[PDB]
Amino acid sequence: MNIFEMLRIDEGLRLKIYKDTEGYYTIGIGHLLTKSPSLNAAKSELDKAIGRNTNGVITKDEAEKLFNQDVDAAVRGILRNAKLKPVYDSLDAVRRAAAINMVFQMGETGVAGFTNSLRMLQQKRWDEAAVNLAKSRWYNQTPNRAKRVITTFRTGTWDAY
Ligand SMILES: CCB1C=CC=CN1
Ligand SMILES: [Cl-]
Ligand SMILES: [Cl-]
């Protein structure tokens, strides 16, 4: 298990445009296309992302290419964020994957707002952090996924996957 296999479990793989848990047009392994309600707008973002006229369908190779880019972008975003980077650097590699998972799902804006959880994580108060992380819209709207990510923060193991 690693961050790629973790997010592949949490996000699935779909090769046609679909709506994510929030109703937003998405493709591949959780590649958000747009928050616009226009499917045509989503298809335009897809063509721009892939570099060809797709009409809403991509290959698994293409999905994995966007996925690798999106994981990389999530990490690089964490490392540019003054709130997230010190907490991320304080973590072991397994909990680092949990941090990337949250940023992948929620965006660095939003995760940087988890101020009290971030402090508990930096302090390695794992059970306290896990309790605070669940007091969130994130947990309430995607509880099974949030429980897996939280268990990874709580234990530093891959037991939930
Ligand atoms: C709140 C989880 B987290 C997300 C990025 C960096 C550190 N921690
Ligand atoms: Cl791209
Ligand atoms: Cl869920």
CB 40 within 8 A of CB 25: no
- At 33, the amino acid letter reads L
* Closest residue by CA, ligand 1 atom 5: 99
Which residues make up the environment of ion ligand 3, defined by Cβ < 5 Å? 142, 144-145
Closest CA to 46 of 28, 70, 22, 19: 28
Is 153 labelled a binding residue?
Answer: no
Which sequence positions are flagged as catalytic?
11, 20
Ligand 1 atom, smallest distance to 84 CA? 6
3-state secondary structure the chain: CCHHHHHHHHHCCEEEEEECCCCCEEEECCEEEECCCCHHHHHHHHHHHHCCCCCCECCHHHHHHHHHHHHHHHHHHHHHCCCHHHHHHHCCHHHHHHHHHHHHHHCHHHHCCCHHHHHHHHCCCHHHHHHHHCCCHHHHHCHHHHHHHHHHHHHCCCCCC
Tell me the CA–centroid distance for residue 51 and ligand 1, in Å: 32
Distance CA 109, CA 154 (A): 22
Distance CA 148, CA 61 (A): 27
Q: Is the CB of 111 under 6 A from ligand 1?
A: yes
Give the ligand at the shortest distance from the Cα of 112.
1
Closest CA to 3 of 79, 103, 83, 77: 103
CA distance from start to end of the chain: 8
Q: Which two tokens stand for residue 19?
A: 């709506």
Q: Entry resolution in angstroms?
A: 1.6
The region, left, alpha or beta by phi > 0 then psi within -120 to 50, assigned to residue 117 is: alpha
How many CB atoms lie under 10 A from the CB of residue 130? Answer: 20
Structural domains of the chain in order of their starting residue, each with its CATH number: 3-155 (1.10.530.40)
Task: Among 114, 132, 148, say which to mutate for ligand 1: greatest number of ligand atoms within 8 Å of CB.
Answer: 114
Closest CA to 102 of 161, 146, 136, 141: 146
